[PDB]
Amino acid sequence: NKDNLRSPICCILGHVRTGKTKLLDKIRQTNVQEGEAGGITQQIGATYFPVEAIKQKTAVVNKDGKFEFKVPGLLIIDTPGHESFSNLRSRGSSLCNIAILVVDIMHGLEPQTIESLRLLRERKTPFVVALNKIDRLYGWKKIENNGFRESFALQNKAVQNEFRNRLDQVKLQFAEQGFNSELFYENKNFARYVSLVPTSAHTGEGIPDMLKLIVQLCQERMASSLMYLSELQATVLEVKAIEGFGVTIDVILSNGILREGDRIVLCGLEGPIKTNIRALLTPAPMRELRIKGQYIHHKEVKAAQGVKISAPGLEGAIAGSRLLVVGPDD
Numbered sequence: 001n002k003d004n005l006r007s008p009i010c011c012i013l014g015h016v017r018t019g020k021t022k023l024l025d026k027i028r029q030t031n032v033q034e035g036e037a038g039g040i041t042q043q044i045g046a047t048y049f050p051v052e053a054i055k056q057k058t059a060v061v062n063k064d065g066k067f068e069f070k071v072p073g074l075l076i077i078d079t080p081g082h083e084s085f086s087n088l089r090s091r092g093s094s095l096c097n098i099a100i101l102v103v104d105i106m107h108g109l110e111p112q113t114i115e116s117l118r119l120l121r122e123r124k125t126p127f128v129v130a131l132n133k134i135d136r137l138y139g140w141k142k143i144e145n146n147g148f149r150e151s152f153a154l155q156n157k158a159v160q161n162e163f164r165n166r167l168d169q170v171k172l173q174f175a176e177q178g179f180n181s182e183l184f185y186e187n188k189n190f191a192r193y194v195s196l197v198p199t200s201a202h203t204g205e206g207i208p209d210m211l212k213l214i215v216q217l218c219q220e221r222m223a224s225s226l227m228y229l230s231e232l233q234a235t236v237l238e239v240k241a242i243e244g245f246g247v248t249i250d251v252i253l254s255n256g257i258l259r260e261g262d263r264i265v266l267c268g269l270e271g272p273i274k275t276n277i278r279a280l281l282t283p284a285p286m287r288e289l290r291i292k293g294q295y296i297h298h299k300e301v302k303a304a305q306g307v308k309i310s311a312p313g314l315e316g317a318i319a320g321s322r323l324l325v326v327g328p329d330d
């Protein structure tokens, strides 16, 4: 049914300083990356992208306009690239229906790329690879926010030669790791072979191709079930004190529908916590949940979304705990 439609979850994974947060910043038109403490990503980030915005940002690679969008929206998960946060990467990976694996085209596959590849392989998660930082190709000239193929056609042959050498050795690296990969238009076996999207976080080039590709991951590679809403699933990302709201929880609503006044149960230090959802909040669209700002009050939220819950007795709450809704009787 057209209602009960579900927004899938996409996880961005990659080696440290590969441009994950920067790519998200370019799509969002924000500056989270500069703001980050320690100059690193240390927490899971949630941004919701309405399908309209995706249509906007994919216009250059879909100018006839006959490409089909059957998703209501897409929830996007940013993850830490550092070696230390294996656990956060694992959690994010557990949550996400599809993925973008970011590779620095200059460096190729690196240890955390390998780790992420194991994570994706183990949970059989459909993914595309973003060859980021293509502007670092010597003598690259920019057309802002343009499809990769269009701008690549305009490049000189030094740039094309460097690009195809790096592309070749990245393909050989993937082959060594047990993956057959292809440049996204060159791929004839979408099910078995991984599409590669050259991108620039600074220039925004290749991003429309990437967006349209994760969309096609949702429509073709992802299970049909997850196109539609189902029995509720939610996971606690964070526990924090917010003023006017006391101790609140940042939660990923993976499936189902969350409602205001719902009696919920989640896990705390020494045991279960049963309470009622007094306030159901989201960040503004195209904005991170962890980043503070304004909130939108909801009387219900449909999966998948990043939400903030205000409720009594959430002090003990544990991150990574599942969240359940308790029905009125028996």
Ligand SMILES: Nc1nc2c(ncn2[C@@H]2O[C@H](COP(=O)(O)OP(=O)(O)OP(O)(O)=S)[C@@H](O)[C@H]2O)c(=O)[nH]1
Binding pocket: 014, 015, 016, 017, 018, 019, 020, 021, 022, 023, 033, 039, 040, 041, 079, 080, 081, 082, 132, 133, 134, 135, 136, 199, 200, 201, 202, 203
């Ligand atoms: N030239 C160029 N630089 C980029 C590009 N993408 C990211 N960078 C630079 O690389 C650095 C790291 O970017 P960042 O967004 O923090 O990567 P990350 O994957 O999120 O890093 P982390 O979360 O694992 S710590 C930043 O200083 C950014 O300016 C790109 O496409 N082109």
Ligand SMILES: [Mg+2]
Binding pocket: 019, 020, 021, 022, 040, 041, 079, 080, 081
């Ligand atoms: Mg980051």
